[PDB]
RNA sequence: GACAAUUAACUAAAACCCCUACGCAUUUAUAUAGAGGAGACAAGUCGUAACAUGGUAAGUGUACUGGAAAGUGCACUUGGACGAAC
């Protein structure tokens, strides 16, 4: 998929004439284009030249062109930074991000991600996994090789897996759960209001929405026994982690609705309710591995119009530089 | 008397920055070597200028002169007189 847009419609082939005026005219503070830094980000040839574009990088966002850091101004940083080694630096710029800012929620995602499975990069992709979550995202088909990446490696750790890892896991199973096309879009999504369950007993509810978008309300449990309900309208650890609350700082509630540690009985009642009738009517990894098998028509329709619309965004964002040095 | 008159711009924006006046100059006041005036009065001195026709009627203007009041010329004044029939 490398050769569908490197007809770059050729420019100049230097960089030091270049990444020398992208700091003249920030000696005299002075804004710089969105078209003198797509000439420096398409003269990456090295590795030196990635980090050439990467301290330059961190001055365009701190800069008054705060925006006007195209799409496509971040996919040839991305596009480009995979011939090489394409092993630390785009992962650092999703780890960073904030002297950086990228947020790729496109096909530009799947690019450098999909190379990934190919050097297999369990302790890697570890985070890219948890740092592409730190955006919201999914009405591209996207979801479900991330949801086909974090079974990989959860039945790998059994562990609370941090201070902050775990509740990390259930964002990062329950916004990737819009998948209804089974079960499995229910039942992935009851593991997903599962695990953020259990913490907020333990440390607090303020732990939920600390840095990633989830609601603050105390229901959380009660909606898997809603979406446990949606299976009935047409899978072991939850036991463990309820009974674990069952055995042996700023507060947001008010009286009537009495807090949830003192709300064991009904969390414990009604998840056997209906297990004794999801048992009446009608692994985890080995499927989606179908799913990717069957579902997937890989649309690279909606990339390939994108690309002329980023030559759509393309000529009319220089030509404007060409009557300005003809009308001088 | 100067300078600035630029980039950047699917959201718009960031950047803008000079200077030369003051000197025992300019204006009034205080202090003074020395010179001169006016006023006052515990007692001197030289005259006798004025007040009576003040012993040359007094005075004004002005000139000249003199220890000092003053004197005199020239022209004015009565704020002097001429004694009021012959
Ligand atoms: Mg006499
Ligand atoms: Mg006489
Ligand atoms: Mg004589
Ligand atoms: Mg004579």
Same mark, same amino acid.
């Given at each position: ?31 710089? #284009? ?152 229910? #039942? ?45 309208? #047409? ?94």
């Amino acid at each position: 998929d490398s050769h569908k847009w490197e007809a770059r419609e050729k420019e100049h082939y230097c960089l030091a004439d270049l990444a020398s005026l992208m700091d003249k005219t920030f000696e005299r503070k002075l804004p710089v #284009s969105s078209l003198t830094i797509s000439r420096l980000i398409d003269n990456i040839s090295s590795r030196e030249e990635i980090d050439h574009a990467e301290y330059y990088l961190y001055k365009f966002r701190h800069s008054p062109n705060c925006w006007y850091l195209r799409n496509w101004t971040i996919h040839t940083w991305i596009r480009q930074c995979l011939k090489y080694d394409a092993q630390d630096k785009a992962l650092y710029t999703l780890v960073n991000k904030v002297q950086y800012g990228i947020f790729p929620d496109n096909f530009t995602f799947n690019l450098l991600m999909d190379s990934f499975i190919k050097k297999e990069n369990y302790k890697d992709a570890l985070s890219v996994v948890f740092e592409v979550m730190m955006q919201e995202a999914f009405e591209v088909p996207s979801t479900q090789l991330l949801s086909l990446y974090v079974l990989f490696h959860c039945l790998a750790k059994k562990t609370d897996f941090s201070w902050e890892e775990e509740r990390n896991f259930g964002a990062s199973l329950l916004l990737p759960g819009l998948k209804q096309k089974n079960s499995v879009g229910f #039942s992935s999504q009851l593991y997903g209001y599962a695990l953020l369950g259990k913490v907020e007993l333990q440390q607090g509810l303020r732990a939920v929405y600390h840095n990633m978008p989830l609601i603050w309300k105390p229901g959380y449990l009660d909606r898997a026994l809603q979406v446990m309900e949606k299976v009935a309208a #047409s899978e072991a650890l939850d036991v463990l982690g309820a009974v674990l609350k069952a055995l042996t700082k700023l507060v947001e509630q008010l009286d009537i609705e009495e807090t949830e540690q003192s709300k064991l009985p009904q969390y414990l009642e009604r998840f056997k309710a209906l297990h004794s009738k999801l048992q009446a009517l009608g692994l985890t990894t080995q499927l989606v591995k179908e799913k990717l098998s069957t579902c997937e028509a890989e649309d690279i329709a909606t990339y390939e119009q994108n690309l002329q619309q980023w030559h759509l965004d393309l000529v009319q964002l220089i030509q404007r530089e060409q009557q300005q040095r003809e009308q001088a």
